[PDB]
Amino acid sequence: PRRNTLPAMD
Amino acid sequence: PRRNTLPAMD
Amino acid sequence: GAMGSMERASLIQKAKLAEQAERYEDMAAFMKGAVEKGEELSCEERNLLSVAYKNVVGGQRAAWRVLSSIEQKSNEEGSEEKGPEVREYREKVETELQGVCDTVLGLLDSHLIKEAGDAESRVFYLKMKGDYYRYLAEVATGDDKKRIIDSARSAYQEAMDISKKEMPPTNPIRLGLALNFSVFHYEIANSPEEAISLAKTTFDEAMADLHTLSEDSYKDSTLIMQLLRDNLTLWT
Amino acid sequence: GAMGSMERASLIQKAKLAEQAERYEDMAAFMKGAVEKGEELSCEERNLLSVAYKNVVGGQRAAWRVLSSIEQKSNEEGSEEKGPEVREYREKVETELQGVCDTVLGLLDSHLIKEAGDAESRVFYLKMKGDYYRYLAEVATGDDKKRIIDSARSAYQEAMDISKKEMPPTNPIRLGLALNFSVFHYEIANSPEEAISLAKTTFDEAMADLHTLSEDSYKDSTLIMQLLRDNLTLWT
Ligand SMILES: [Mg+2]
Ligand SMILES: [Mg+2]
Ligand SMILES: [Mg+2]
Ligand SMILES: [Mg+2]
């Protein structure tokens, strides 16, 4: 599970 | 559901 | 040839790195460069070539079908005119798709097919030729659409004649050829009955040959027989 | 500018077609062409620009991380030498990634940021600037790695100062900025405590502002607060 950043890939 | 052909995309 | 400067072995090593990176454009350019070294391709190298271009052209076919569907909706009765942008962009993608198909057909023609003496290599390349004439046929609308279809049928038929004389009915290239040739009959040649007959006959003869196979060969073949059975379930 | 010949409106229409086709390279080239017409971008057009380049650079970052991992494994003790191919191909992908980052930073610099007067547009562009300096920082190893990191922090900080004075704590651009700035603290700047503090504080202040929102605004904001909470669950 990778930490989140915005925006995300398709 | 699409009919199958080989090889298939990743 | 921007790959003419790189070692054949480095081109093959980087095609495998590109596959793991999911960089299929790079993978195809590397395998294009490897083919242009003029040596025949090993079994593994043929798979890399095929896998690379199938992913490239598969991304283009998916995009072509989305744009072609938007373009048809904008040609309905009561559709609001939006101008030429949908048609222009569908044309751009289509032209790019035809270039990839022509690149592959150029590699098979110069000179992979004429140097392929073994059944497994020659059937593999003739299948590829049928497949890429088939992708061109999916977008063809002019005078040459009939000629493109016959170019696909002709390459498919020659591969089928060889594979029937030279390979067991469970050989994965033979089953993959039959799967793809069957779908050509169904959705390109308007021969749904021929499509169903070839898939049933291919499935039945492989089933009868399974007892000769090792557990790993058995897994390879049964995997492709399941795709034949899925198509048959969809068409009947 | 190979897009200098196309209408701004046709470039925007084709960026949207390219998104539906999942043709992100085309989408970015179209939005690059739209920006180079020299007019400011609307809210929707800013999202298209951001969405297009994020997918392009995201494919490159994923590939860079696979190749960098293979390259590190081949530098182990008891690793079998395989030659320079892994390093050369990781360098090629990395150079292509740096070019995309430089293209985006060039658009923000010429001249999107200096014409962006509204809080929402200026915060959006300054966030983008921090993000693309961050992607350069992910692959930087030389003298300028410190300067790249400070270029990212500096753009992030200015966006944060504006968004704090000019936007509610639930504004999606403000929450997206805080999410990304937080991750910069965690994995780029070696400030995991600062990363956790910003994410907790951003989450808490938005929670307290949710009561002012409509159901659709509430769905937009809560979606981003859930990403903040996921990062916090991963880091604590
Ligand atoms: Mg070269
Ligand atoms: Mg019948
Ligand atoms: Mg132009
Ligand atoms: Mg602590």
d(CA C188, CA B3): 13
Q: Tell me if C3 sits within 8 A of C11, measured CB to CB.
A: yes
- Kindly state the tokens that stand for C235: 């068409």
Structure letter (DSSP) for residue D211: G
Residue type, B10: D
d(CA C86, CA C74): 9
d(CA D100, CA D210): 37
**Exposure string (b/e) for D165-188, b if CB count within 10 Å is 16 or more?**
eebebbbbbbbbbbbbbbbbbbeb
**C54–B7: do the CB atoms touch at under 8 Å?**
yes
**C89–D62: do the CB atoms touch at under 8 Å?**
no
Alpha-helical (H) ranges within chain C are 8-20, 24-35, 43-73, 85-107, 113-115, 119-139, 145-166, 172-187, 192-209, 215-235
Q: Give the one of A1, A3, A7 whose C-beta lies nearest to D183's C-beta.
A: A3
Minimal C-alpha gap between A1 and chain D (Å) = 9
Which of C11, C17, C55, C60 has the most D C-beta neighbours within 10 Å, making it the best mutation to test the interface with D? Answer: C17
Q: Tell me if D137 sits within 8 A of D152, measured CB to CB.
A: yes
d(CA D10, CA C181): 40
Ligand nearest to the CA of C200: 2
Q: Tell me if D121 sits within 8 A of D46, measured CB to CB.
A: yes
* φ, ψ (nearest 5 deg) of residue D153: -55, -50
**C63–D93: do the CB atoms touch at under 8 Å?**
no
Interface B-C, measured as beta-carbon pairs within 8 A, has a size of 35
d(CA C10, CA D226): 46
**B3–C55: do the CB atoms touch at under 8 Å?**
no
Q: Tell me if D163 sits within 8 A of D198, measured CB to CB.
A: no
Which element (helix H / strand E) includes C75? none
- Kindly state the tokens that stand for D157: 């900080």
Q: Is the C-alpha dihedral spanning C156, C159, C164, C169 positive or negative?
A: negative
Q: What angle do CA D22, D6, D25 make, to 5 degrees?
A: 25
What does this entry list as its resolution, in Å? 2.5
Residue type, D190: N
- Kindly state the tokens that stand for D94: 């990395």
DSSP-assigned letters across all residues of D150-164: HHHHHHHHHHHHHHH
* φ, ψ (nearest 5 deg) of residue D39: -80, 150
Discontinuities in chain D (C→N > 2.5 Å), after residue: none
Q: Tell me if C48 sits within 8 A of C14, measured CB to CB.
A: no
List the subunits that have 3+ CB pairs under 8 angstroms with A.
D
Q: Tell me if D162 sits within 8 A of D123, measured CB to CB.
A: yes
Residues 6 or more apart whose Cβ sits within 8 Å of residue C228:
C175, C178, C179, C182, C199, C202, C203
d(CA C178, CA C184): 10
Question: Closest Cα to residue D221, out of D195, D234, D202?
Answer: D202
d(CA D140, CA C10): 26
Q: Give the one of D17, D20, D70 whose C-beta lies nearest to C17's C-beta.
A: D70
Contact list, D130 vs chain A (CB under 8 Å): none
Q: What angle do CA D103, D106, D108 make, to 5 degrees?
A: 115
Structure letter (DSSP) for residue D111: I
Residue type, D109: D
d(CA D196, CA D51): 26
Asked if the C-beta of C179 comes within 8 angstroms of chain B's C-beta atoms, the answer is: yes
Residue C192 Cα to ligand 2 middle (Å): 8
- Kindly state the tokens that stand for D229: 């909470």
Interface A-D, measured as beta-carbon pairs within 8 A, has a size of 35
Q: Tell me if D148 sits within 8 A of D137, measured CB to CB.
A: yes
Residue type, D54: K
**A6–D224: do the CB atoms touch at under 8 Å?**
yes
Which of C179, C221, C223 has the most B C-beta neighbours within 10 Å, making it the best mutation to test the interface with B? Answer: C179
List the subunits that have 3+ CB pairs under 8 angstroms with D.
A, C
d(CA D50, CA D28): 9
Residues 6 or more apart whose Cβ sits within 8 Å of residue C105:
C129, C132, C133
Q: Give the one of D22, D59, D66 whose C-beta lies nearest to C63's C-beta.
A: D22
Residues 6 or more apart whose Cβ sits within 8 Å of residue B1:
C230, C234
List the subunits that have 3+ CB pairs under 8 angstroms with C.
B, D
Listed residues: CB within 5 A of ion ligand 1: C 3, 5-6
Asked if the C-beta of D203 comes within 8 angstroms of chain A's C-beta atoms, the answer is: no
Minimal C-alpha gap between B1 and chain C (Å) = 9
How many helical (H) and strand (E) elements, i.e. helices and strands, does chain D have? Answer: 10, 0
Cis peptide leading into residue D111 (ω within 30°):
yes
d(CA C107, CA C53): 12
Which element (helix H / strand E) includes D16? helix D8-20
- Kindly state the tokens that stand for C216: 């790993």
Indicate the CATH number of C8-236 among 1.10.10.10, 3.30.565.10, 3.30.70.120, 1.20.190.20.
Answer: 1.20.190.20
d(CA C206, CA C118): 21
Nearest CA in chain B to C56: B9
Asked if the C-beta of D234 comes within 8 angstroms of chain A's C-beta atoms, the answer is: yes
**C131–B4: do the CB atoms touch at under 8 Å?**
no
Q: How many CB atoms lie within 10 A of CB D119?
A: 17
Q: Tell me if C42 sits within 8 A of C71, measured CB to CB.
A: no
Question: Closest Cα to residue C159, out of C189, C138, C129, C187?
Answer: C129
Alpha-helical (H) ranges within D74-191 are 85-107, 113-115, 119-139, 145-166, 172-187
Which of D174, D231, D232 has the most A C-beta neighbours within 10 Å, making it the best mutation to test the interface with A? Answer: D231
